Each structure stands twice: as C-alpha cells, then as structure tokens.
Amino acid sequence: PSQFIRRDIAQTVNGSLTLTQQTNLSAPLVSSSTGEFGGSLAANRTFTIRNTGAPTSIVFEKGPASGANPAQSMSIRVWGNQFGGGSDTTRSTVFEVGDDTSHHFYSQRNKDGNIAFNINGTVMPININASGLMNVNGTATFGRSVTANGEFISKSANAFRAINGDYGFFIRNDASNTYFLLTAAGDQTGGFNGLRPLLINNQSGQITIGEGLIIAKGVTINSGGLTVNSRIRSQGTKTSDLYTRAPTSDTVGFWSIDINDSATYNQFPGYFKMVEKTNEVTGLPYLERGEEVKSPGTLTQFGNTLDSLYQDWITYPTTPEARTTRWTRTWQKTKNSWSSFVQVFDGGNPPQPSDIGALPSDNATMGNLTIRDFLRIGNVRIVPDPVNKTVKFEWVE
Amino acid sequence: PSQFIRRDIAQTVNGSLTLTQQTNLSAPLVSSSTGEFGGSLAANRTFTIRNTGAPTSIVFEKGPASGANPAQSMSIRVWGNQFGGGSDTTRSTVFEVGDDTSHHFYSQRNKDGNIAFNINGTVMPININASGLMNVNGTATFGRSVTANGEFISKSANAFRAINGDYGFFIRNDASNTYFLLTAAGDQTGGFNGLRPLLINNQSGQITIGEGLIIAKGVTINSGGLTVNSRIRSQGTKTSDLYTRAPTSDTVGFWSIDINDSATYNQFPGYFKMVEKTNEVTGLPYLERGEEVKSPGTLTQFGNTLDSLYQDWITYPTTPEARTTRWTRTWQKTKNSWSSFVQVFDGGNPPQPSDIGALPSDNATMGNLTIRDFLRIGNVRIVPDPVNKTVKFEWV
Amino acid sequence: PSQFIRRDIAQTVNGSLTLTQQTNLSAPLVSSSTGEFGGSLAANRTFTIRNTGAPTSIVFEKGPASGANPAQSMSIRVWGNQFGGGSDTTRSTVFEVGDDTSHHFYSQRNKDGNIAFNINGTVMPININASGLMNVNGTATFGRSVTANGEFISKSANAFRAINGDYGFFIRNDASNTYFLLTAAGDQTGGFNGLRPLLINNQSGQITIGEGLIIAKGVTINSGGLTVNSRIRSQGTKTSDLYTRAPTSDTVGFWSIDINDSATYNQFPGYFKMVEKTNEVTGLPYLERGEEVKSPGTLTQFGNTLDSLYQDWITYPTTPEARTTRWTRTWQKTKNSWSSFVQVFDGGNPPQPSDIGALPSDNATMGNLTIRDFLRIGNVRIVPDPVNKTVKFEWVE
DSSP states (O other), X not given: OOSBOBSSSOEEEOSOEEEOSOEEESSOEEESSXXXXXXXXXXXXXXXXXXXXXXXXXXXXXXXXXXXXXXXXXXXXXXXXXXXXXXOXXXXXXXXXXXXXXXXXXXXXXXXXXXXXXXXXXEEOSOEEESSOEEEOSOEEESSOEEESSOEEEOSSEEEEEEETTEEEEEEEOSSEEEEEEOOTTOTTSOOOSOOOEEEEXXXXXXXXXXOXXXXXXXXXXXXXXXXXXXXXXXXXXXXXXTTOOOOTTTOSBEEEEEOOHHHHTTSOOEEEEEEEEOTTTOOEEEEEEEEEOOOEEEEEEOSSSSSOEEEEEEOOOSTTOOOOEEEEEEEGGGTEEOOOEEBOBTTBOOOHHHHTBOBSSSEEEEEEEEEEEEEETXXXXXXXXXXXXXXXXXXX | OOOBOBSSSOEEEOSOEEEOSOEXXXXXXXXXXXXXXXXXXXXXXXXXXXOSSSOEEEEEOOOSSSTTOOSSOEEEEEEOSTTSSTTOOOEEEEEEEEESSSEEEEEEEETTSOEEEEESSEEEOXXXXXXXXXXXXXXXXXXXXXXXXXXXXXXXXXXXXXXXXXXXXXEEEOSSEEEEEEOOTTOTTSOOOSOOOEEEETXXXXXXXXXXXXXXXXXXXXXXXXXXXXXXXXXOOOOTTTTTOOOOTTTOSBEEEEEOOHHHHTTSOOEEEEEEEEOTTTOOEEEEEEEEEOOOEEEEEEOSSSSSOEEEEEEOOOSTTOOOOEEEEEEEGGGTEEOOOEEBOBTTBOOOHHHHXXXXXXXXXXXXXXEEEEEEETTEEEEEETTTTEEEEEEO | OTTBOBSSSOEEEOSOEEEOSOEEESSOEEESSOEEESSOXXXXXXXXEEOSXXXXXXXXXXXXXXXXXXXXXXXXXXXXXXXSOSSOOOEEEEEEEEESSOEEEEEEEETTSOEEEEESXXXXXXXXXXXSOEEEOSOEXXXXXXXXXXXXEEOSSEEEEEEETTEEEEEEEOSSEEEEEEOOTTOTTSOOOSOOOEEEETTTOOEEEOSOEEEOSOEEEOSSOEEEESOEEEEOOOOTTTTTOOOOTTTOSBEEEEEOOHHXXXXXXXXXXEEEEEOTTTOOEEEEEEEEEOOOEEEEEEOXXXXXXXXXXXXXXXXXXXXXXXXXXXXXXXXXXXXXXXXXXXXXXXXXHHHHTBOBSSSEEEEEEEEEEEEEETTEEEEEEGGGTEEEEEEOO
C-alpha cells in the first residue's frame, strides 16, 4: 500500500532502521539530533561546533585507568563573560584547556582587545624571546651572564653583591650612607660584619675609609688641607750622595732621613766634644769647643721648589759621651749648590770667644786696650791725670 | 517494476529519506558529502580532519551574545607556507589558534626544523624554568632577588643604581671616567646632582675624591709623595708625661702639640726675662738675661725612627710682657733618654758672656791680662821701654 | 513480501543502501562502527572523543604539498603513563600537540597534581608577567632597564660590569680581594689590564688605591697616622700681606711658601753681607755683620692652633755675595700680633761682642777693669806689691 518504502520519491520512515551493512551517501546528511559512533570518525577540511546559546567544547575522555590513558578527562572550551551580566565582563573570548580539577592553560582576548596566555603552573621552554616587557614577582636565578642595554636598579638596601670563595662583597644604600661592605667568612649571602671599608654620605658626598688606606703613585690634596692624628713619617729617599745631591722636582718638599751609615755621615758635619771650663772669678761654667766627631744624624729638608729649599742636620749620639749638634744649609739655585753647613749656636754648642771676636774672660792676650776711668791691679788704682798729662797710681785704702 | 527498497541486497535509493526514529548502524557509514547534527556528536578514539588541498581546521562558533558565550568565534587551524602563500616559505607546519581579529597563539616548526611557540600578547605563568637562553626587549621588573652565576653587564652609561629613602646612588661609566654618583633628594631615578664623591679615570685609573675624605686606621703612601693645599695639622698625642715620655713606634714622626696647661708646661723650659742695657762707650744696646718664666709652648717633633728623632720647644707669650724662647733636644736611643733641652741663641735670646767664657764689656774683673802693644788710660799710652826694663808714658 | 523494507515499524536491513539524495534525521544516529565524510562536518555544542582503552586524539592532515598546507600532519593527543606499569608513572594527564617529528608543546598535570606547560623550542610572547619564580639556565639579554625590589647577587668573580665607549669597568671579587678594574680600550667585555685603581682586602677591609689619588675639600686621618714615601709639599696660600697676616683657622698648621717677589720679600728681614776680621794676636778670623740685603726666602709655619703657632724665614741667595740667614717669630694670640722676627745665631751669622755685652778681643775700650794677679804690657809684668803698698814691675825675657 505505502506501509513499504519507495526507492524513487521522498519518504518519511516511522520505524527504527537497523542497518547491518555499509551505508553509502552521496548527498548531505542533515540531522536535528545526535550522532554516536563506536568506531573512529573523519570529515573533510572543517569541523564546526555550532553554538545555539551555550559555549562549545571538545571532550577527550580518560577511559579505563590502564595503558597510556590519562588520569582525567580534558576539554577545550571556547567561552566568555562579556554578555553574562556579572561583576566581570572583561573575559571576552577565552580558549581554555583543562581537566576535571582546573584549567591547565587558556588564551584570552580581554574586553580591552589585548591577549593573555595564562599557564596555571610552570612554563618550561628552551629559549625565551619576548618583544615586550617582563615582570617576575618571585625570586629569579640565571645560570650565566645577564646583559642589559639599560640600567640595573635595586630598591633593596643591600643592592649589589659579588660572592666568591669565603666572602660576599656588597653595596648597601641604607638611605643615609652608601657603604661598601663585607660578610663574615662563610656567611656569603648574609649580613655585613664589623668592617667599614668605605662609605659615602648620601647628603654631602663625603667619603670615609674605615680600615686603613694604602696609595701608590702619589697623592694631591687640591683644597681643604690635611689633618692627621697623630704623626707623619715623611720618609725621604736615602742615597749615597745626599751630601752633594742637587734637588729635583721629585725630591723637593718636606722629609726626614736617618743617615746611619758612616760612609754617608762621615761626609756630613759631626758633633763637637766640649770641655766644661769654670770662670775663675764667678765660678760659672762655660763650654769650650773641642774636636769634631763624625756621627749619624737626621737630615730634614723643607721647602717646595727648586728655588725654595733648605735642610737641617741633627746629629744623634750612639756612644756614651757623644753630644748632639745641629747644622743648617740652604739650596742655592743660582749657584747650583748647597750652601756649606753652618753650625747652629745653642746652649749645648755655644759660640766661642774666637768665633765672634770677644776677649776671653781670663788668661787673655790682646794687642791694645783703652781704659777711660780706672784700671785696678791688686790694690792699686791707675787713673787718668790729664792736668799733668800722665796717670796717677792710687794705692787703695 | 518494484520501486521498493529491497531489505535483502544492495539498493541505490533515489528519493530523499527522512528518518523519524533512531537509526542504528553496525557497519561503516561512508559519505562523499557533508554531515550536520543539530545535537551533540561523539566518536571512538580518533577524529581525523582530512585534507584534500586546503588546511584543516576546527571552528568554535560564538553563538548568540548572551550567557557564557565568547564575543568572537575561534579556530584551530593547521597550515603552512612552504608550498604556497606569497613571499615567505619558512613556516612549514603551523598550529594556529585565534579569533576573528587575529591569532592568540601558535606553535610552528620552521623550514630549518626549529619550534617556536608564539603568543600574541602577555604570557602569564606562575613559574618559569627555561633550559636555554632569554631575551627581553622591553623593560624588566623583578619582585625579589636576582642571582646570576655569571656576570652582570650594563651597556648603559648609568649602569648600576641602588635606591633607598631619598637618594639614588649609582655607578656611571661615561666612556672617559667612571663615577660614583648621587641623586638629589626625592629624585631617586634621576640624574646626578653636583656632588662628585669618587671618579676613576678610564685611561689612567687615577682616582679623584671630590667631597672630602676621612680615613681611620692609618694611611701609607707607598710611592709618589704627597702634595697638600694648603696646610697640614699633624696633631700629636698629648700626654701628661711629654717631658719624659720615651718615643715608641707609634709616636715617632712629625707632629706638633700645644702644651697649654701649666701642669705640663711648668716642667718644660720657660722663656727668659731680658733687660736692654747700653754700652756706655759705644752706645750700642745688648740684652741681659734675667729670670726664667714658665710658659705655654708648642712642642714639635721631627724624625721617623727610634734612632732618628728630635724635638723643638717654642714658648708662646700669654701675658703682656712675656717674651718667646726656643729650646731643643735630641732622642738618645743608646742612653734611652732625651738630651737636656738647650736654649736656641737668637736675636731675642742672645748668649751672655758667662755662656761663652768671654769678658764682659765693662765693670769687669779678671785674674790676668797680657797687652802686646799698648794700654791707654785716658789720653796716656803706656808702652814697654826695653832700654830701661820698664814702661813709659806718651800723651794723646 | 519481507523482501522489501517496512515503513512503519522497526526493520533490520541486510542490504547495503546507497542514498543519493539528502538524508534527513530527526532522532539519534547510533553506530558501533566508523564514519567518514568527504565533505565538511558540524555538530551542536559538544564533540566527545570516547575512550575505550587507547588515548584519544584529533588528527589534522597535511594533505598535498600545495597552497597553504603544512609540511607535516599534526595531532592533539590526551594521554598519560600513570597506569602503564612503566618506570615513569608521573605523567598523569597530558595534552600534547605535535607533528610527525616531535611534540611542539604540551600541558600536563603530574601525579603530584602540579601543572607544567612544556614548549619544545622558543617561546615568543610580547610581554611576560610571572606571578612566581624564574629560572633561566642560559645567557640572558635585556633591551632596557632591569629593576629588582631585591638584591642583585653574582657568583662570578667578575660580578658587575659597566661598558661605555672604549672601556669596561668592573667589580671583581677574586675571593681574596675585591677590585675595581678596567679593560684595555676596545676590549670592553674582556679581562682587566694592569691598572689597579682600587681594591679592598676581603679579610681586613683595608683599601689600596694603585694609580694615584686626588682629593678635594680636605682630608682628615682620624687615627693611625700617616707615612709618606718620599716627600710632602705642604703649599701655603701666598698672599701679599704675609708679613702682617694674622693666622685664621684655615691657615694654622704646617706649610712653606716660596716668597720670590721683592714686593713681599722687601718687607721681611734680609741676609747680612759678612765681614771677616782677624784677631791681631791669634790670627784667628771672626765674622761681623756688614750691610743687610733684602732677599727672596722660604716662609715656613708650624703649629696647629691660634695659640700654638710659629714661623721660620730662611733667606735664599740669588747673587754671588748673597748668604742664607734664618729668622724666627712666634704668633702672640693674646697680643693679636706676631713677635718681631729675630735673627738665628749660627756659624754663618754669629753673635757679635756688642750683641752679647762682651768686650771685643781687638782695639777695645772700656770704663774700668780690675785685674787680680798680673797685667803684662809687652815684656813688663805689673804685679800687686802689697808689702810696699804699690805695684812691682818685672821685666820678663
């Protein structure tokens, strides 16, 4: 009648067909319902998951817990919240991959049009090459060098540290001063010890070096002077020829030298032996200069130029009866020579009557003497007697 | 004939069927055409998108703009340009994910066989662990420490900066000199102010410290000497026992001490009062020594060693008629003592006849004198007369 | 009869049907077998790949090597090894994308529940924003500034380097000392040259500056003193008023000045041209002062305070007959004046009899003299003759 199906015209089948043989189609299959295949599936070029009100997804089933199967099912879901009316409408288009516990990753176009790729864990690339910015909130470690075309800036008080062997060296800006500091040995990442090698006042720029300073190749203080607690050893260059050496631009200035070798000090002036004499009349001692004796001594130079330069020589005693005598000379640029050392006159080295043209206090001899008022010999006074053009001899008493 | 579908052998059906009940299959479905399901679809194990000349893709539709739908449709496409597509041939195999506007990301293998994973925006992981290298073209910020097993190199003139509080401190290599510099207060990322704490010349390595230098625990200049503009205060260690103090390795050298306290300066030589007298005969004045007067003074030492060491003591006046006198002594290592201070003779402090063994210029007494030529008394010469065995007198 | 298909009840079919027109479904399609579509395919909302023991995948075919086709096929596979009984069972759930040669990338959740996203090559984002840690094993390069809230630490002996123009400057902790060093010109990334600008001893903190030091705005040594090899030029500030200038807190201390200009040196003491006289009886010479002659000289100051301050003036000869004479003075704080310069007495500049109140040895005149024992004139001794209350004459031969 029409309870059987036609091969030639359109037809509506109201019984469930089971097809036990291969079904072939050469025209569109259009269903308003589901498809289920117990074997594999293939289609040409494009698979489209259609959306009529809910986000689209692919589900990868986990299957039995055996072989190469995963522990959880996963999905790809394409969704957003721009149209959902929540407190957040900024997740405009999201491609999210995850399992039953949480997403693994997603890409997202924000409502602002920018794209994010979120990874819910650790990203493990080989190389990284980012065209834009980097931020990293946690600790960072690099296995090799780090080069920047810009500046390195630290907001940590301990800012820059170099660790090698037993010690950390570091630069610390504590807001008041910037310090160059060192760790205890074996505490290389830790705090500063008690050493204060160098600091810089952040306000004034003034530097304090706290554990001693050695300088090679000269020092010049341009301004402000120098204060020293509590001695200066200005050590002159000691040469065999100090007695005759012309100064140079390198040897001008202040220094002292200990001339302690006889080959040198024998060329220099000595001390003088002194004999303590007694004035017969008054009993007061006076020193009579005796023989010169060569001695070690200190040579001290002063003055800063090849014109302005002088020296002092101060003998020091090394034998039990040795005395000390000082001597002076001045550099004579126009003569290209040192003046001859002259003796300083002092209470240990007094000028002698013959040095100055003074009559000795006793046992004296002279060419001539003029007496205006009287000469007394023993108890006789000799006085002028001009009225008789002679002298009177007055026995006293 | 029969135009009815045989239930028993192979049948080509040439009208459109419309199946209202569940359709079961137990053998392959094989179509040369499209499929469209208005409900969900499932398959076992594997889904293959066949490629007969155009790249394969999955399209995820956006649907109506409501609920949890995305604003744009997305696609996964597997494509390349090694065999076509304009000028680039190096993108061999690309797995691209994106929306109607642009890709979000892709992986590719290039023609040389290397893999890139491109993200068209911000990658936001928790941790990063890269086995190879890193390049970042833009500014970088780190929330905690940054440790490198290698060196940190900056190609920026301002190279390394430590900011804390009001100030940035920084090292600047300007190509000529390397400077340690400071910002103005509250300009911590900015340029250097006028301070010049320290620079190093890049050619000579000579250092200039520009805002003063304090040093503790000693200074030694190994070579090249020292030049100072424009004074040196070498301040000796003032102790109560300076008069008797033996030098030590610490106190040898040059210094000066102001001995201003009588407890100490009373131990040292004073100045001498002096009275100007006039020689009656010549009219020429001379200074006659009187009482010693204790006085503050400057003690200055010279010499660098326990052998080579001497001192000067220069009194300074603190009362209106006070004079000034210098005194000297030498350290005597072998006797373990300072020599006694001796007075310096100078124009303000001349020797006296008593110091030198000389007769005073008048009112004098002596034991004996010998006169070779003549003794004149008033206007009479007393001379010897051999032809008489005595003296003779001669007027004028 | 039942050689045709019934159109109104359930019908098992055992022929192979070939449908040449569009097939329309309005109820589920349920197959135990495969599906293959030579055109495109679409479903609504969800696609599920079922798993009955082997991991699920999608395969994207490369097709012919033409147009916009890829060089290799790709797949997405969701798989694991937790259940496989192998030596690694930690890869619990893996979402893996790759081609015929290898994976490109994968996400996984491990057995510990943590997520990794592995990229088998170079990750190329625009920006990076990591909420956790960063480790990079290879070389790192940064195009702009690098700012850390924490400390920068290097474990490299050469730790921090600033390159500009021809030179690298760097800080090197070699485990013994920390050095500030410089490259040769044009070797900006290389080793140190021979320069030693600054180093810090890691154990003591002592600093050595090796290529000279200039300091401006003053130096103070708080402790430990100063040693200088091998001279000190303490250069006083030379003003026109040095003769009368009161000291100030800036000018106290030790210095020397070369007073080489007559406008200034004519205000200071001169030297004396000396005149040699000869004792008539001994033939021994003695010097006395001739004319004073103004001269350039060295002015040297000593002392540290406005109380404790003195000066020396040492003339230097600039002509044949010129001689060096020294002069001294003391700052008198309570009088607010320098003492008058007084002449130093020395061998070149001895005191005269008239300076000391001594009788001249030659050609002397005095008011009175008392002789106790004898006066001899030529060959006659005049002696006290107390027995005859006079004086006795005694010719001596």
